[PDB]
Design a protein around this ligand. Structure first.
Ligand SMILES: Nc1ncnc2c1ncn2[C@@H]1O[C@H](COP(=O)(O)OP(=O)(O)O)[C@@H](O)[C@H]1O
Ligand SMILES: Cc1c(C(=O)NS(=O)(=O)N(C)C)cc(-c2ccc(Cl)cc2)c2cc[nH]c12
Ligand SMILES: O=C(O)[C@@H]1CCCC[C@H]1C(=O)O
Ligand SMILES: [Mg+2]
Ligand SMILES: [Mg+2]
Length: 258
């Protein structure tokens, strides 16, 4: 179908674990898009060549306004190219870095957008497993778009950057389901309000212990309603975390969204 010759390449949009993401334009249609470029040698060396097929198969079949589109893929002798929807306002990561913290209204609107995209995903037993600011993209209207389905799988799974967003069950290497994304949502809510993730540390070692123990504290400015929602999402036991319907009906969400 597609080949590299069909696109004009622009500036890089960001650094990837196995290559780079570039702005690109489809020559015939003038369609601006993001081209996720991955080196075959690097994928092979890490043994993630089939998981890349998983990212493609899962993302390509999701249709939701808060989920980044994957249009297709193609590959040559040395690279794999993923054809993605271009998110013109960039990452939530960069917005957080420039704004420091988000107010309750911005946070709760993003949580609602995430819960709606996640509800959709989980309805197909799809687990994202890599929900984090650098993977949360922004559309033309500033709407949140879940991206980077790189580590995505169908639930239940026991399949093997920082640990900041990963729940205890995945950090230990145990069986896990859709509840992993509910923990990550909790870590995101805290980060949006506070400016840093709740288990952030200098080392992977210190962060591992913090997640395992559920060792976190809130700054005094965090409201009672925000503490309630976060504390509920951050349960060591996946069974005890709420459904996404419950997150969406939380009084703090309904009062501050959208
Ligand atoms: N569709 C896109 N539009 C705009 N920027 C993007 C897009 N996809 C990725 N990026 C940028 O490139 C980075 C790497 O993309 P990503 O899919 O997350 O790769 P990886 O799996 O290596 O982390 C993102 O964190 C973001 O900064
Ligand atoms: C060598 C190779 C192929 C492949 O079949 N290539 S080819 O023999 O047709 N040849 C041109 C070299 C295909 C892939 C691949 C993996 C995932 C996707 Cl979504 C698409 C392609 C990868 C990933 C790492 N090495 C790869
Ligand atoms: O698209 C990718 O860069 C990779 C494909 C293979 C699994 C890991 C994944 C990633 O880092 O998101
Ligand atoms: Mg990423
Ligand atoms: Mg990824």
């Amino acid at each position: 179908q597609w080949a590299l010759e069909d696109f004009e390449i622009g500036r890089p949009l960001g650094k990837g674990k196995f290559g780079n993401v570039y702005l690109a334009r489809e020559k015939q249609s003038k369609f601006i898009l993001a081209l996720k470029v991955l080196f075959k040698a690097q994928l092979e060396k890490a043994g993630v060549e089939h998981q890349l097929r998983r990212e493609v198969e899962i993302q390509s079949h999701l249709r939701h306004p808060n989920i980044l589109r994957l249009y297709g893929y193609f590959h040559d002798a040395t690279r794999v190219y993923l054809i993605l929807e271009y998110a013109p306002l960039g990452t939530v990561y960069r917005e957080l870095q420039k704004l420091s913290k988000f107010d309750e209204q911005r946070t709760a609107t993003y949580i609602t957008e995430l819960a709606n995209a996640l509800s959709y995903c989980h309805s197909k037993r799809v687990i994202h497993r890599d929900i984090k600011p650098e993977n949360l993209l922004l559309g033309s209207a500033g709407e949140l778009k879940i991206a980077d389905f790189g580590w995505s799988v169908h639930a239940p799974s026991s399949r093997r950057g920082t640990l900041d967003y990963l729940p205890p069950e995945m950090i230990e290497g145990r069986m896990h389901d859709e509840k992993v994304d509910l923990w990550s949502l909790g870590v995101l809510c805290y980060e949006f309000l506070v400016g840093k993730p709740p288990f952030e540390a200098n080392t992977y070692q210190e962060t591992y212990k913090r997640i395992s123990r559920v060792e976190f504290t809130f700054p005094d400015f965090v409201t009672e309603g925000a503490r309630d929602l976060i504390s509920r999402l951050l349960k060591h036991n996946p069974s005890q975390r709420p459904m996404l319907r419950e997150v969406l009906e939380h009084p703090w969400i309904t009062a501050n969204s959208s």
